[PDB]
């Protein structure tokens, strides 16, 4: 469901921005996802250090355009798997870091619009596959939770 995925995307951005929501904290699924997607994010950032400077993420519309282009490329072969889904979260982490630095008239609520378009992409493009492969709780978590 959209709301569940939106919460994962918002939790991940709040984790990257070092502002986890005060309170009882993220779910077990969200905690597992943060760990595994951050490992991906850091390696992507290291490998792509040169080209990450080729954009200036001045607005949320710039971030959405980059997101659409990168994800159309990422899924061009039609293969959906958990690795690619994790990479979506790693990529929104890179985008939010660039927006924090580069957004004109920064808006501390920006991570909520990025979470929305991330959830929209995941739902509409990978949602069926996710359900058929166990959902987050019987698919993703079972595969990636600590040994
Ligand atoms: C030098 C690249 C470049 O100019 N840009 C770019 C392109 C793609 C990016 O990220 C995608 C998402 C992470 C990485 N994909 C994978 O690692 N996928 C493997 C194979 C499938 S898997 O098993 O799931 C893992 C490539 C980035 Cl971060 C950057 C630009 C288009 C660019 C530059 C800066 C920003 Cl902020 C956005 C885009």
Distances (CA, A) of 124 to 25, 28, 73, 121, 145: 27, 24, 16, 5, 25
Experimental method: X-ray
Domain that holds residue 5: 1-147
Residues 6+ apart with CB under 8 A from 90: 37, 38, 40, 41, 44
Task: Specify the CATH number for the domain of residue 23.
Answer: 1.10.437.10
Quote the number of domains for the chain: 1
Q: Which two tokens stand for residue 114?
A: 């990025």
**Residue whose pair of structure tokens reads 């985008």 in the numeric block:** 95
**Residue whose pair of structure tokens reads 């502002």 in the numeric block:** 19
For the chain, breaks with the C atom over 2.5 A from the next N come after: none
Span from the CA of 90 to the centroid of ligand 1 (angstroms): 9
Atom of ligand 1 nearest to the CA of 95: 36
Q: Which residues of 7-26 are buried (b: 16+ CB within 10 A; e: fewer)?
A: bbbbbbbbbbbeeeeeeeeb
Lining ligand 1 with CB less than 6 A are 44, 48, 51-52, 54-55, 57, 66, 70, 74, 83-84, 87, 91, 94-95, 98
Span from the CA of 27 to the centroid of ligand 1 (angstroms): 27
**Mutational test site, ligand 1, from 13, 41, 48, max ligand atoms within 8 Å of CB:** 48
Query: Which among 85, 78, 72, 75 has a CA at the least distance from the CA of 130?
Result: 85
Rg (CA), the chain: 15
Integer Cα distance of 133 and 79 in angstroms: 14
Span from the CA of 69 to the centroid of ligand 1 (angstroms): 10
Cα maximum dimension of the chain: 44
Locate the DSSP E strands across the chain.
none
Integer Cα distance of 95 and 62 in angstroms: 10
Whether the Cβ atoms of residue 96 and residue 113 lie closer than 8 Å to each other:
no
């Amino acid at each position: 469901e959209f709301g569940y995925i939106y919460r994962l995307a918002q939790d991940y951005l709040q984790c990257v921005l070092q502002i986890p929501q005060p309170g009882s904290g993220p779910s077990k699924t969200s905690r597992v996802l943060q760990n595994v997607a951050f490992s991906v994010q850091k390696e992507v950032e290291k490998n792509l250090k040169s080209c990450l400077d080729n954009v200036n993420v001045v607005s949320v519309d710039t971030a959405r355009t980059l997101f659409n282009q990168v994800m159309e490329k990422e899924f061009e072969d039609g293969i959906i798997n958990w690795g690619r889904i994790v990479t979506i979260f790693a990529f929104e982490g890179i985008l939010i870091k660039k927006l924090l630095r580069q957004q004109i008239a920064p808006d501390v609520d920006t991570y909520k619009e990025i979470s929305y378009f991330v959830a929209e992409f995941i739902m509409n493009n990978t949602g069926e596959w996710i359900r058929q492969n166990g959902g987050w709780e019987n698919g993703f978590v079972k595969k990636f939770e600590p040994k």
